[PDB]
């Protein structure tokens with residue numbers, strides 16, 4: 604799988620690269636997409652099937668994944684996880700809450716960002732440092748964005764608060780083999796959480812493979 608390259612029972616994952624015919628949403632999920640265009644219906648159904656395949660590995664019966672007030676997925680009792688969908692990719696990573704405090708994942712096409720988007724998602728220090736820490740010709744702007752998204756998705760279930768693109772400063776390293784590596788997101792705002800210690804540093808991994816960027820953060824419980 605692509606997502607295994609960015610991950611460290613207590614943790615499980617599943618991914619698909621298309622929308623298989625014959626998948627349906629669970630009844631509890633169906634209203635959430637009753638009025639949605641086909642592309643949205645399909646990604647929603649497929650990514651939630653991935654989540655249930657992952658939850659099944661952790662011993663959890665098939666269950667609906669509803670959405671909270673800020674769109675965040677609602678996991679079965681005792682579980683945490685993250686979802687992502689982009690062109691050519693649907694993925695889920697889930698964890699047992701006793702061992703895994705939070706998960707955030709993201710996938711994007713490995714393309715340059717559209718003009719004007721980089722300034723909206725980066726800090727000036729990231730634009731200055733990432734060219735020095737990443738292999739030439741990779742789309743470090745898109746990889747940075749992918750890491751910002753994983754950072755938010757791991758942050759929000761623990762804080763239930765906004766995190767802006769300027770509120771996390773992300774430093775990157777590259778592995779010797781050149782298409783994977785580590786990142787560290789440092790939170791620049793108050794990181795108080797609903798329980799447990801505050802969020803200040805979140806360590807993740809990135810990977811470029813088959814035209815996709817994958818990023819993931821798994822915070823130990």
Ligand SMILES: CCNC(=N)NC(=O)Nc1c(CC)cccc1CC
Nearest residue numbers: 717718719720721722723724748768
């Ligand atoms: C066809 C889509 N084209 C885009 N340019 N979409 C964005 O810019 N969205 C966005 C916004 C909302 C305007 C605010 C901050 C940062 C971003 C980038 C994720």
Ligand SMILES: CCNC(=N)NC(=O)Nc1c(CC)cccc1CC
Nearest residue numbers: 751752754755766767768769770771
């Ligand atoms: C480091 C901080 N990163 C974020 N705050 N990222 C988001 O807000 N991303 C997002 C956007 C971007 C404008 C639109 C719709 C839904 C989502 C959440 C998956």
Ligand SMILES: [Mg+2]
Nearest residue numbers: 659660661662
């Ligand atoms: Mg088993």
Ligand SMILES: [Mg+2]
Nearest residue numbers: 646687688689
């Ligand atoms: Mg998506």
Ligand SMILES: [Mg+2]
Nearest residue numbers: 687709710752
């Ligand atoms: Mg995303």
